[PDB]
Amino acid sequence: HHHTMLVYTEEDNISQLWGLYEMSREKLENDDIDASVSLVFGTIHEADRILRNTEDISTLPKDFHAAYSSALLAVSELFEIAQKRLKETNTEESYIDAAIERAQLGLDAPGNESRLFLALARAYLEKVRVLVWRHDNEESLANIPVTQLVNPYIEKAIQYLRPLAQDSTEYFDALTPDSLRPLYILSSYLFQFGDQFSEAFLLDVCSIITALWLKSVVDPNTPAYYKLIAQEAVLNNYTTFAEYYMDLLDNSESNVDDLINKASSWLNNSVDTWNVIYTLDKSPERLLKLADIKMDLAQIVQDEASQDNYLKEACNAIKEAQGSGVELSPDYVEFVEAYSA
C-alpha cells in the first residue's frame, strides 16, 4: 500500500532509472527472482514520481518511456512470482499490454530512439506469444486464423527491429543477448507460418534477426557466457534456414538444382558459427551437433566423393564425442556402427 523513493535530479535520474532496470536483469541471472521483481516494481514506481513531478511531460525523452515500458514488460515476464503482490485482478497479458501502451507514448517524445524501439519490438513480440496461446485455449478465438490474429503485431515488431539491425544504428548498452530473447518468438513464428511469406520476405527478416544477435555481442570483451547465448541463436537461425530449403528441395515443385546450392552455403554458415561456439565453450557433447550438420550436408551435396567425406567427419565427430565420455543415444550409436561397415 506504499512506496519509498531513491533519486535527486531529472536529467541524471532518467539515467538512474535505467541502472535500476539493468540491476533487475542482473539479479535475474543469479536466479534471485524476488530481488528482480523488487527492482522492477521499484523502477515502475520511480518512473511514476518522475512523471507527476516534472513540469512538462512532452519534455521527457524517448529513453524514459523505454525504461518505463521495459520495466512493465518485466512484470509480465516474472508474473508467476510478481502476481503475489498485486490485487486479485491483474494479468500477465495486461502488463504486456501496458508495456506496449507506455512504449508507444514515447514515440512523440524527443530523444534518441534506439532504446524505445527495442522496447517496442520486445513488447510486440511478447504480445504475439500470448496471442498464440489464447488462440489455442480460448474458445472465443478458436476459429479466428492465428495468422490473421498475430500478424498486425509481427508487422509492427519488424517495423522497429529493421532500423536497429542497420549499421547506422550503432551499439547501445540495452541491446544485450538477454534483451533479444523475444526474437525467438519471431523465429518460430516464421517457422510454422512460413508457407505464407515470400522467400524474399523470409530472407529479409531472418537476416534482421541474425544481424541483431551478433550486434548485441559486438564488443570483443563481452564475457564468453554472453557470446554463447547469441551465437547459439545465430546458429539455430542458420540451421533452420538450411532445413527450410532442404524441405522444399525434396518437394521440388520448381525442380531447381539452384536451391540445393542455396541451402549448402547456409550449412557452412552453420559450421562456421559452430566452431565459434565450440571455441568459447569446448564441452565435448557439442560434437554431436557438428555431426548433425555434417550429415545434413552430405544429404544434399552433389557428388558421392563429398557425401562419403561429410559422413566420414560426422562419424569421427561422434566417435570423439564418445571417446570423451558422452553416452551416445541410440540414433548416434547405430550410425557409427552403420558407417564403419
UniProtKB/Swiss-Prot annotation:
<comment type="function">
    <text>Required for correct translation termination. Positive regulator of the stability of the N-terminal transcription factor domain (Sre1N) of sre1 which is released from the membrane and enters the nucleus to activate hypoxic gene expression. Also acts as a direct inhibitor of ofd1. Functions probably by inhibiting the ability of the ofd1 to accelerate Sre1N degradation in absence of oxygen.</text>
</comment>
<keyword id="KW-0804">Transcription</keyword>
<keyword id="KW-0963">Cytoplasm</keyword>
<dbReference type="GO" id="GO:0043169">
    <property type="term" value="F:cation binding"/>
</dbReference>
<dbReference type="Pfam" id="PF22329">
    <property type="entry name" value="Nro1_C"/>
</dbReference>
<dbReference type="GO" id="GO:2000640">
    <property type="term" value="P:positive regulation of SREBP signaling pathway"/>
</dbReference>
<keyword id="KW-0810">Translation regulation</keyword>
<dbReference type="GO" id="GO:0006417">
    <property type="term" value="P:regulation of translation"/>
</dbReference>
<dbReference type="GO" id="GO:0045944">
    <property type="term" value="P:positive regulation of transcription by RNA polymerase II"/>
</dbReference>
<dbReference type="InterPro" id="IPR024318">
    <property type="entry name" value="Nro1/ETT1"/>
</dbReference>
<comment type="similarity">
    <text>Belongs to the ETT1 family.</text>
</comment>
<keyword id="KW-0805">Transcription regulation</keyword>
<dbReference type="GO" id="GO:0004857">
    <property type="term" value="F:enzyme inhibitor activity"/>
</dbReference>
<dbReference type="Pfam" id="PF12753">
    <property type="entry name" value="Nro1"/>
</dbReference>
<protein>
    <recommendedName>
        <fullName>Negative regulator of ofd1</fullName>
    </recommendedName>
</protein>
<dbReference type="GO" id="GO:0032933">
    <property type="term" value="P:SREBP signaling pathway"/>
</dbReference>
<comment type="subunit">
    <text>Interacts with ofd1.</text>
</comment>
<dbReference type="GO" id="GO:0071456">
    <property type="term" value="P:cellular response to hypoxia"/>
</dbReference>
<dbReference type="InterPro" id="IPR055243">
    <property type="entry name" value="Nro1_C"/>
</dbReference>
<keyword id="KW-0539">Nucleus</keyword>
<dbReference type="GO" id="GO:0005829">
    <property type="term" value="C:cytosol"/>
</dbReference>
<dbReference type="GO" id="GO:0005634">
    <property type="term" value="C:nucleus"/>
</dbReference>
